[PDB]
Design a protein around this ligand. Structure first.
Ligand SMILES: *[C@@H]1O[C@H](CO)[C@@H](O[C@@H]2O[C@H](CO)[C@@H](O)[C@H](O)[C@H]2NC(C)=O)[C@H](O)[C@H]1NC(C)=O
Ligand code: CL
Ligand code: CL
Ligand code: CL
Ligand code: MG
Ligand code: MG
Length: 292
């Protein structure tokens, strides 16, 4: 839309020198008239290098491999440009030592590909049908709408539990449980997941690693540590990438045939599997799985 210093953007974006609303350096930096500097202006900071060669997990996903998977995330039209770094990812992963470090190298690669595929989908700046190089374009839900509070739990900030970070962590209960396990008060300070890159990655790896009955963890599914428990066989829940989509968002995406969101998750996964030189494995969709 149009805007000026005296008419800010209704939805809160930067008002450019020429009076249009947006979230890129052209709107937000030089000459910006209102609600400025909401994205980084200029070159990203140089790498901290605090992860070095990445350690144990860096044997599966090097610095270069991380930046090849997430090739276009620092395009000028990604609002999260410069936020997501290899050094923060490796520091976060060190807090969940089994992640990407369980099983033979084919399983470790496929776990990491699946994790980056699901988080790339949650934060996608790409177009339906691909290609699949612009994961991790965003770090906050674009139009935060409904209160995201399950009434069972404390809710000091009813409008503030919208999606943040690589898995777009949402709902008061997930901020409670995640914050508890990573020693952060995310219930009272939920913006930590969009202002601190290490905490942001920790929240996504936390979700990936944590069973929440009846759901197994995405980790145990992808590393061949889950077996269908009874109700599961006749709900159609078979081990593979599709079951991680069911765990993440199956109530809205699974059990009713071809769906564009599911296809986008699978598209990122196949692309990342090709980069890693591995096969995606079996049961890639959840089209005939009952949701949890
Ligand atoms: C991002 O968050 C982390 C964790 O809250 C910060 O690093 C920790 O800071 C505490 C003190 O505040 C230290 O005792 C820890 O040793 C730090 N490292 C950890 C927990 O791994 C970090 O400083 C934050 N980054 C920014 C830029 O604010
Ligand atoms: Cl980086
Ligand atoms: Cl395998
Ligand atoms: Cl769900
Ligand atoms: Mg979302
Ligand atoms: Mg964003």
């Amino acid at each position: 839309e149009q805007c000026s210093a005296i008419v800010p953007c209704p939805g809160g974006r930067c008002c450019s020198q020429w009076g249009y609303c947006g979230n890129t350096p052209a709107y937000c930096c030089t000459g910006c008239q209102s609600n400025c500097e909401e994205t980084v202006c200029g070159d990203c900071p140089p790498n901290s290098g605090s992860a070095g060669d990445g350690g144990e997990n860096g044997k599966i996903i090097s610095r270069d491999m991380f930046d090849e998977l997430l090739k276009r995330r620092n395009d000028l039209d990604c609002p999260a440009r410069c936020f997501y770094t290899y050094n923060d990812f490796i520091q976060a992963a060190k807090a969940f030592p089994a992640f990407g470090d369980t099983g033979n190298d084919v399983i470790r690669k496929r776990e990491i590909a699946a994790f980056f595929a699901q988080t790339s989908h949650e934060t996608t700046g790409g177009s339906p049908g691909g290609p699949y190089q612009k994961g991790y374009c965003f770090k906050e839900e674009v139009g935060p709408g409904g209160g995201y509070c399950g009434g069972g739990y404390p809710c000091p900030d009813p409008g503030q539990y919208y999606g943040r970070g690589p898995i777009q962590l949402t709902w008061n209960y997930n901020y409670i449980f995640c914050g508890d396990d990573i020693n952060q008060d995310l219930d009272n300070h939920p913006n930590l997941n969009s202002v601190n890159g290490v905490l942001s990655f920790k929240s996504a790896i936390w979700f990936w690693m944590t069973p929440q009955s009846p759901k197994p963890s995405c980790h145990d599914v992808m590393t061949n540590e889950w077996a269908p428990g009874g109700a599961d066989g006749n709900a159609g829940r078979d081990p593979g990438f599709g079951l991680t989509t069911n765990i993440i968002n199956g109530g809205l995406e699974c059990g009713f045939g071809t769906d564009s969101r599911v296809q986008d998750r699978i598209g990122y996964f196949k692309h990342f599997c090709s980069n890693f030189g591995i096969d995606p494995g079996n049961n890639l969709d959840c089209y005939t799985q009952t949701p949890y």
